[PDB]
Structure formats: structure tokens, C-alpha cells
């Protein structure tokens, strides 16, 4: 598995940290290859012809997009993953990316917090049963409520029992936490189980914590690595 | 402090130095064979008791340069006194012309010592990079083969048997100024040898690191746009010799005047050390000026470990920028002479190096005069000593034997300092290092 | 002259304002056409097939670039001008834009200010004679201080007379102010003329000031409109 990571920021570096090993050959480009991530020669010097995955996590969507275009057109680099922060681009994700124009490859339910991937999975499971979206924020929850349909939108604080116990915690089949507070989520999940919640799904944004969650009373852990590394490792 | 690892590696180093000690023995040399055996015995004793290994660095470089005269003086106790024997050993051993005054095999070995000195200094110089894998041996071998073969064939063309040509070639590998006769070139002057040798002198001592790309297939040689300043100085040297010749109307014939005059000026100037004139047809100032010329020495990435074009160039050009500062302090100065924007990090150490260097210069002048030496002959001697050409032409008493043997040791350390970076020894003496 | 302006922000709107008239038909797209500036239908609805110029001044370079690509590929829209704020893209402007990959079409000298177009005109005139770059700022200067060559850099305060009179203002042929907030520039130039400066070049951001500069003692005015509108309106 030959991996090129464009941009060694927090995301690129942390990724690189999680992928070093025997079956993985990691190259990182940042201005190791010192140069501009979307320049044909910089990309060539990182061995884009032979590589099996390209991950673009630079400062800019336009550089990520340019890198994936340049890599594809010049070296036919398979599996091109790119970070795109702009909702404007995603609004046309079908026509722009999924057409290969820009060659980028990549009874009661209750979720607490909003995750983009979580929204996707929540969109995969809200067809079968109604989903209680609970969100901390007020503006985001309201905007989200107008924006999306087929889901039930609530608000409330999660660090106090007067909302989750209020909401008949025995009458709900799962508690899913999308909050990005790392572990708080873990002891708050232990506590969540303590109040009588049936199933606690926890946001855990590291795949190096596997040894830390391994001897846990927490009945399911969830890493964004196991998916976002898999689209390349598919 | 992990003494086993140091002991085994150091023992191996002495044994390795000793292996290259069979050179006289080819010419039917028992003490040199003995030195190989004794050091090999040293390596063997260190090697067998200890099996361990380590993996401070400055200690290793000092130690590496410490070995070169641990086995260079044994066969001399040539019947001459022990201090003189040590001094003479260093004289032969270093690329210096420290004449105070032989067997055919020993003489061949002495020229061979020049060959050994000639290649060791360059490899160490390129090698300094980790503190500031052996694949460079083949490329250096090709370039070296080219240099030696060219010199030998060049001598062979001027009507001589290959043995004599090879002998002269060995003599000129690292140029002490020695020859078959202490007269550098007066004893033998065929015009072809003089012209060819002067060409050799110019090409050989200025820059080979730049042409290391010559080992690669690509031809990156057209590199005309170190070059401009250097040619200006040498051309100026030619013009001044031309002016001096015209003023004193010395020689009417062009060949003798230009070749001999040019040869003397370039040879004394280029730090080659080949001197056959006593500068009478020249004024007295010319020996003094030439001595100052002798102070300049080495080009970057070259055998000469002296002041360089980049350092002085930096001081004058950066100094020019400093002159601009004198005009206005509220003016930002950033200037790049050639390839790229130079950092202010490395540049202070160049002249802090020069300042410390001057301090060392004061130490050498004061110490050498102070130890009991004469004011003037020693004065010329210290200038010559730092450069490493030979003994002082001014008020000549070049051969000193009756000089203080402890001062002779000081002379050994001083000339070694001239070849080596002086500081390497200095770090050990500094308090708080311990 | 049929003009489409993508994005009606400060720049798009002000442009639209300057330009309304008899010989100009202005259409502005913003999310008048309400939609995403780089969507094929939004662009079609703004009449990109027939238009004579684009101007892409949205929030994002990647949308500007996408708009110019989509417009060119689908409607062959001539004269495509785009705002690109990212120096990373401009660093490869030759290989990216000027190749048509991304179809975007667009004795003593003394300058005070580091304008980008004035870096260009300044780059056009520094070959003939040495140019005194003087800049107010320090952080913009310390990077620049060895970044560009064939020009002499300085620092100093514009209002501070002790700086302009310092250096023999009679010994310098021009005074060129790239500073924003033009009124100051207008008065300083007058002040500059009062001190004995020979020629005063003034940054004046809006073209519409021609009637305001017309009865002026200021001996040359400089508008970014007369050029940046001309590459389209020529």
C-alpha cells in the first residue's frame, strides 16, 4: 500500500502518524517531499505513477482539487481522497466530482450532536425509523431544522440529566453521541449507560485509542479512521 | 565512558593506518614493517578482549588527526637527535617545506608521504558534513587517476625516461617545494616542463568539488555565467609582473622573461612553494609583497586550508554594504552576490572566525618571537609558517637547527595548525568544556 | 458589451455600479440571477453563450475557477476575468491558467506602497532605472526584503516628512503612492508637491472620481478601473 499525503498539517500529520507500519509506505508532501502539492514535478517526485492512494489535505480546496486533477491526468493515480471544506462545492458534488470532471474519488432513534459522516449514516438509518436529532447549538439546530426533513430535530444540553432522563431514556433504543469532545464522550457515555440508556454510540476521533477503549464498559466505539482509511484500503 | 567501544575502533584505526606502511619495502625498510607489526599488534590486543560497540564527535576528529605522527617518527631515532628527528619527521610528514638540511627507499617514501597527505586532507574536508556509505572512493579514484597519469605523461614528453618522470610526478603530488635538488627548478629547466607545470599549478589547486558533477553523465560544464574575482587577481598579478619587468628592463627575450618571471610569480603566489629565485632582480618590496601573496591560500573545496575568496569577498562586499550603512543607518541592506539570498546566520561566524583567527595569529607571532627567536628572521618565518611554504626568504637563514627544540615543537604545532582547522585543538583547552 | 458579474459582493457590486450605461448590459449572479455562479444552468440563465465578458468575483477562488471552466467548456464565453486571492495558485499561474488548463484569461525612481498591479508596472519600469521601494509596514517588508531583486527596498512613514525630505526630494524624479484610503493620498500628494517633489503618482481606487480629480493640482491620477476593465472592454 503506497500512500501519498499532500499537506502535513494537523490532519495530514496525524493521518501519517496512524498509518506508519509494515504494509504501508507513507510519503508526505508539504512546502518527505518539499514542494507545492499540485505541481506535476512535486507529484512525480512523490511517485504518483506507482502509488495506490492519494490523500489531499492541504490548506485549500482549490489546491486539493488541482492536485487530484494533475495526479489523475498525468499519472493515473488510483484512489484520490480530498478534503473539501466548502459547502458550495458539495452542493454540486454530483455534477462536479461524481462525474469525474474534477477527478476526486472521495423504534425511537436518538442521536446527540451533528457529524457530517454521522449525518450520512443517520440519513442511511432514518428511513427505517424516526430519528431524534438533538443538538447543543441553537442557530445550527434551527438552520438544520429548516434545511433537512424526514428527521425530528430537538435541542438540549447533554451534560445534565434533566434532558435525557426527561426524554424517557428507557423508551429509546439507542443513544448516539456525535460531540467532538473526544472522551468527555466516554465518561459521559458511561454516565449515559448509568441513567438507563440502552445503547451508547460514542464519537472517538482516534484509531490509536483502540487499546484505550479495549477494556471498556462502553458497549460500542466509533472511529472516523476505520471508514476514511478504508475507501483507499477498500 | 564506554571505553571498550572507543578502544576497539581506535585500535582498528591505528592498524588501518599501519597497513599503508609497506611503501619503502618495495625498494630492496625494516622499521616501517615493524611499525605495521606493532600497530597491528595494538589493534589485535584491543580487538580481542572487547566485543562491544557504541552506536564526543569532536574528540573523534581530533583523535583521527592525532594518529598521523604516532608512527611517522619511529624510524628516525638519517642519524639525527630525537627532537630534530621528530621535527624532521613532521617536516617530511606534513605538506610543508620545513628544511633544516638520503636513502633511495626513504626518499621515495617521503614523496609517497606527500601522496598520502595529498589525498587524506580532501576526503576529510568533504566528509565534515554529519557534524556540520563509502561510495566516494570510486569517483575520487577516477579523478585522481586522471591527475596522476596526466602529470606523469606530461613529464615523460619532455625527453626523459619514465622513472624520472614518475619521480618528479611523485614529488609534485602535494607540493612541498622539494625536488631532487633543493633548488626547486634551477637544476632542471626544460621549457616544456615549465609551461606544462605552470598549467598544472593553476588547474590543480583551485577547484575540484565544483567539477564533481563531471562524474555524472550529464554535461553541466559550461558554467561561465568562483571565477570572476579570481581571474581578476591573477590577471592583475600578470600585469604587475609585466610592469615590473618593463620598469627594470630585465630580459629582452619574451620566453625567458615571461616563463621564468611568470613561473616565479605564480608559484610563490599560488602557495605551491616552488621557489628558485632570491629576488635581487626584483626590488626588496617584491619579496614582502609576494609574502603577502603567500598569505592568500586555498580555494574553496581545495587542498589549501587557508583564507578563501568567499570569506574576504564577504568582508569586502558585505563590507561595501557596511560602507553603505555608514551613509545611512535607516537603510535596510539585503544583497545577494550570486546564486541566492544569503542567510545572516552563517555570515557572522565567518568574521568571528577571522577575529579568532587574528587572535591565533597574534599568539603565533608573539609566541614564536617570545620563545627566544630573532625578531626579523622569525617574523618572515611565521608568515611563511602559517602559509606552509618553507623558511623565510627575508634576511635568509632558512635552515634553523640551533633553534629551541621546544620552539621546534611549537613550530610543529603551528604548521599543523596551518594545515588543520586550528580550533579543533582549541575546544579541548576551553574551561567549562570539562 | 454584454457583461456577467458572478458574485455581487463589495467588488462585484461596486463594479456593477461603475459600469451601468448605454453601451453596457450588466447581469449579476448571486445566491439579476439567483443561483450558484458555477452551475451550468445558472450560467446559462445569465446568457453566457452570448455574453462578451464574466467576471468571477465570488467568495471563493475554487468557485471562480469552476465558473470560468464551466462557462468556457459549455458556452465558449470570451474574456473570462477571475479574482484569485491565493498566492499558491499564482505561484503556478503560468502552468495552470496561461496554458488554458483552467480557462482564466485574466534617474531615481521612488514608489511608496506595494501594490500588486503596481508591482507589475513597477516591474515594467525597474529594468530601465533603479527603483526605491519604500513601504510603511515591517512584516510585509521583512519577507519581501530579499524576495524580489533588481529593486532597492526601504522603509519609512509616509506622513512623516522627516523621511521624504530626508532623502533629497529634489534629487528624485517621481513620487508614486500605492497607499489605500485615497483622499490622504490626494492631500499627501499636494503636500508632496509642496515639499518640492517633481511628479506625484496617486492611488485612487474608484474610476468614478474623474469629476472629483478633474480640477486638481495633482498632476496625475491612477485608477485600477481603467486597466482592469479594459482587458475585458478591449
Swiss-Prot record, chain B:
Keywords attached to this entry: Cell inner membrane, Cell membrane, Ion channel, Ion transport, Membrane, Metal-binding, Potassium, Potassium transport, Transmembrane, Transmembrane helix, Transport
Intramembrane residue windows: 82-93, 94-99, 161, 162-173, 174-179, 190-205, 254-269, 270-275, 284-295, 296-308, 373-374, 375-385, 386-392, 405-416
Subcellular location: Cell inner membrane
Chain segments carrying region Selectivity filter part 4: 387-392
Segments on the Periplasmic face: 158-160, 180-189, 276-283, 371-372, 393-404
Function summary: Low-affinity potassium transport system. Interacts with trk system potassium uptake protein TrkA and requires TrkE for transport activity. Selective for permeation of potassium ion and rubidium ion over smaller ions such as natrium or litium.
Name of the molecule in the record: Trk system potassium uptake protein TrkH
